[PDB]
Structure formats: C-alpha cells, structure tokens
Design a protein around this ligand. Structure first.
Ligand SMILES: [Mg+2]
Ligand SMILES: [Mg+2]
Ligand SMILES: [Mg+2]
Ligand SMILES: [Mg+2]
Lengths: 55, 82, 55, 96, 121
RNA sequence: GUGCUCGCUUCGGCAGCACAUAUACUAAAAUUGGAACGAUACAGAGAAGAUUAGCAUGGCCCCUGCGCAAGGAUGACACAUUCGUGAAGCGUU
C-alpha cells in the first residue's frame, strides 16, 4: 500500500484522470470492437491539454 | 459471532497461553490384527507444544507467486458506422 | 550479547561494539558497507538506554 | 501465513462506537416524523425571513458615471475556469 | 504473444504444453474468439477428436452468442459422421433463437439427407 | 529412598503397608547442498543533439528503513502507388 503524497500528487491526479477518461469512454464510446484509439484518444487528451496551456 | 471469532484471531498479533489436554480415538485403515498389538483402535493424547516467548518469527513469508485462474455465459456494425 | 548477536546475524564483521556500548567501525568503510551497516533508531535507542544502565 | 509485522497506524484508536442519541437524531424519531410538513414549514419560514431582509467651466466630459450600477458580474457564477470572476480578480491581483 | 507461443510448441509436437498455454491464455481472456478457434483447431489438426469435442462444448457454453463456434462445431461433427451429434448440437443452438441464417443452415443440414419431415418441422 | 506395622524379632536378614510415578528437538556427532556487493576481469547511467531535475505506472525483481514516511541512478527491469487464394454459410440465374 502506498499513500498519496506531495511528491506523488500531480502524478496521481493525472494517473487517475487518464484512468477516469479511459474507463468512462471506452466503456461509453465503444463499438470499435478491436481496440478503439485508447492510446490515440489519450494522445488527443495530452495534445489538447498542451494546446490549452499554450492558449 | 462468526466474524468476531475471525477478528480476534487477526487481533492476536496486536496483543502477543493455551492449556488444554485433549484425547482422540483413532481408527486406522490398515488393521490386519498384526498392525497394532491387536486393537481396532488407538488413543492419542494431543498436547499443544509450549512456545518460547522470546523466539523470533521462524520463517520467511515474503515469497510471491502469480495469481491463479469458469466464465459465466454472457447472454447479452454498419459500414458507415465503422 | 544481544547487540553483538544482531551485528553478527547480519554479518557486519567490520563493526565493533565495545563494552560501554559504543558502536564503532573497525576500518574506514566502503560505500556499500556504509549502506548495509546503518542501524535505525530502534537499535541505537536500545544501545543508548543500555549505556545509561551500564553507567 | 500471517506476518508478525505491525505498524503505527494500525494500533487501536476509537474503539467505541458513538451511537446516535435521541436528541442527536436517533432512527426512532426519524421513522415517526412527517418530514414533508417540517420541510414545508421550514421553507416558508426561510422565505419569510428573506422577505423581511428585503465651475470647472472647462472640461472634456459630461458625466460618465450616470447609470453605472456595478452589475451582477459577481452574482453570476461561471463554470469556466478562465472566465470566472474569481479568476479575473486573481489574474488582476498577481500580475503587475 | 500467447498464440505465437502456442503455435511454436504445436509445431514441435509438444501438444501437452500447447494445451496448457491455451488454457492459460483463456484464463487471461476467455472472451477472445480467435484464441478459442486456434485452440480447437490445434486439437483437430492433431486428430485429438475428443479434446476438440470438449473444447467446442465449452466455447458454445461460455460464449453462446458467437455463431462461428456453432457453425464449426456442427461442421466438425458432420465430418466425423455423427449426424445425431450434429442434430443435438443444432437443437441446443436453436434454443438461443438465433438468426435467420442459423435456421437456414439447420434446415439445409437436414436437407443434405432426405429428412424432409425434419426440415418441415 | 523415608517412616510405620506392640510384623517374624533380633538388632542381621526378610515380609507387609503407606508415602514417592514417566525426563529428553536424546547426539558431547556425521553428513547434505544457497549466499560475500571480496578481488579480478570485461563492459559502462533513462527521456531529444548533448547535459542533466525529477514524480510516477506494472510485478514469479528487490535492498535500506519502526514505519500507511523517505530513500536506494527518476533503485533496477519496460524494445506511397496495388491485391488475391482456400474453406464454410446464406440468397439468386
Ligand atoms: Mg524525491
Ligand atoms: Mg540526478
Ligand atoms: Mg524513489
Ligand atoms: Mg522507479
């Protein structure tokens, strides 16, 4: 067991955001049936987040 | 009641004495009349061995072995959609 | 005797415990030896309490 | 195969369970209550309370500050992090 | 990765190992239909009729909706010559009230033999 | 072994009785096979061109640590052209 902590918080929040989106949407979006763009949809996520950081 | 029993065992760790002499009567499965002196049964007095209170944990538990493996039946696309 | 047995138990042959409970090292230590030889507060606390009683 | 290891956190604490009391709001009271009436009357009371509560001969410019009554920008809550009024205030304060 | 490993041991005719690989793969993901087809296929290639029979039964039991399993199962029995067996399978299959095509295949099955009364039924 | 039988009865022996009731990983041994982070030897730090700060994720990988703390190299580990077979099922000429 490991306890959330200051060193780990930013990593933690993004970890469980990637998981939040992954579970939600791949249990939400589907019918690709094979693998639906999980790597890709998440890359769209990080891309969008960078874009909003760059305005 | 059942849960409480279980809990007490777990809690035994947190709180670091047994005195029962208990007898048992045994029937073997070999028999044959020359196997014992010549008794269909034997009797054994079971005694719990006394543990040395300053004895450290004897042996090492850390070792790790991969999780073990039937699925219930499930019972539950257009080109354009694809 | 306890503390020497602990020391030996771990094969720390380059430490030396004297009779007034000062834990010293025999030789200048190698990096690896230094890692392995550290005791935590539990051992040192015990050692110092014993020192007090020996006084 | 249960380890003799321990930890500080694990030790006893709050071994007693605080059961709710009668004035705290034991389930007995709750079962008997007609909540709907209570909720209505409280609501009414709240409403009532609310009701009770409520020269220079020379210049470029004639008055700019005519009808400028603040506006409800701090009454609007906005679900948008960069256009919330809180964010504006923060941005105003900390950058030069 | 699972499949390639299974295939390699199959090629060396170490099929007991292969079986264990397939079972382990199934433990990971029992829903994967390619996996099951490769497993049953492997048994059939090595003439292990009864193993294959077991496997087919499992596949249709746990993933009844997969029509590929049913079509292959009946085909295998037909090839083996066991018309009765195939009929039994199809009767099980029909309990799931499947798809127009499945019913057609059952009827056609009957019509490869005279069995017109059966077909009509 | 101790005591007692107005025991046989001398002071020796013998008898009766009472009390007293099951130690111990027996070895002061013999054998049997994993580890030292020793030296030596070879080789030589993740991320992008380089130099580096790091938190993480996963567990037939651990170590230090009382620790649900923190460290161990971020501990290590993580390597644009253009189609057709073969079989089966279904409907049709
Ligand atoms: Mg750090
Ligand atoms: Mg560094
Ligand atoms: Mg670390
Ligand atoms: Mg790491």
């Amino acid at each position: 067991a490991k306890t959330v902590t200051k060193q780990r918080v930013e990593s933690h929040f993004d970890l469980e955001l990637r998981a939040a989106v992954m579970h939600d949407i791949l249990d939400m979006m589907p019918e690709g049936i094979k693998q639906n763009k999980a790597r890709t949809i998440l890359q769209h996520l990080s891309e969008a987040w960078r874009c909003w950081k760059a305005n | 009641v059942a849960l409480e029993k279980s809990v007490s065992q777990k809690v035994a760790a947190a709180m670091p004495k047994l005195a029962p002499a208990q007898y048992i009567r045994y029937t073997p499965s070999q028999q044959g009349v020359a196997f014992n002196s010549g008794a269909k049964q034997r009797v054994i007095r079971m005694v719990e061995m006394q543990k040395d209170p300053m004895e450290p944990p004897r042996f090492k538990i850390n070792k790790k072995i991969p999780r073990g493996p039937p699925p219930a039946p499930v019972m539950h696309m257009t080109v354009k959609e694809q | 005797n306890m503390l020497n047995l602990l020391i030996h138990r771990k094969n720390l042959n380059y430490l030396h415990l004297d009779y007034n409970f000062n834990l010293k090292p025999v030789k200048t230590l190698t990096t690896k030896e230094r890692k392995k030889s550290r005791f935590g507060n539990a051992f040192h606390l015990c050692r110092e309490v014993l020192r007090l009683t020996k006084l | 195969q249960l380890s003799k290891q321990y930890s500080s956190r694990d030790l006893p604490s709050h071994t007693k369970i605080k059961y709710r009391q009668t004035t705290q709001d034991a389930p007995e009271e709750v079962r008997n209550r007609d909540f709907r009436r209570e909720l209505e009357e409280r609501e009414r009371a709240a409403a009532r309370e609310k009701n009770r509560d409520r020269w220079d001969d020379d210049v470029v410019f004639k008055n700019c500050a005519k009808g400028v009554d603040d506006q409800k920008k701090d009454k609007r809550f906005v679900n948008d992090t960069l256009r919330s009024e809180f964010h504006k205030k923060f941005m105003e304060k900390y950058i030069k | 990765n699972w499949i390639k490993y299974a295939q390699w041991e199959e090629s060396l005719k170490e099929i007991q190992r292969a079986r264990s690989i397939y079972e382990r793969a199934l433990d990971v993901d029992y829903r994967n239909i390619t996996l099951w087809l490769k497993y049953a296929e492997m048994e059939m290639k090595n003439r292990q009729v009864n193993h294959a029979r077991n496997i087919w039964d499992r596949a249709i039991t746990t993933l009844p909706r997969v029509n590929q399993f049913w079509y292959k199962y009946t085909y295998m029995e037909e090839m083996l010559g066991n018309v009765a067996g195939a009929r039994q399978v199809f009767e099980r299959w029909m309990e799931w009230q499947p798809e127009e095509q499945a019913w057609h295949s059952y009827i056609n099955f009957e019509l490869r033999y005279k069995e017109v009364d059966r077909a009509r039924t």
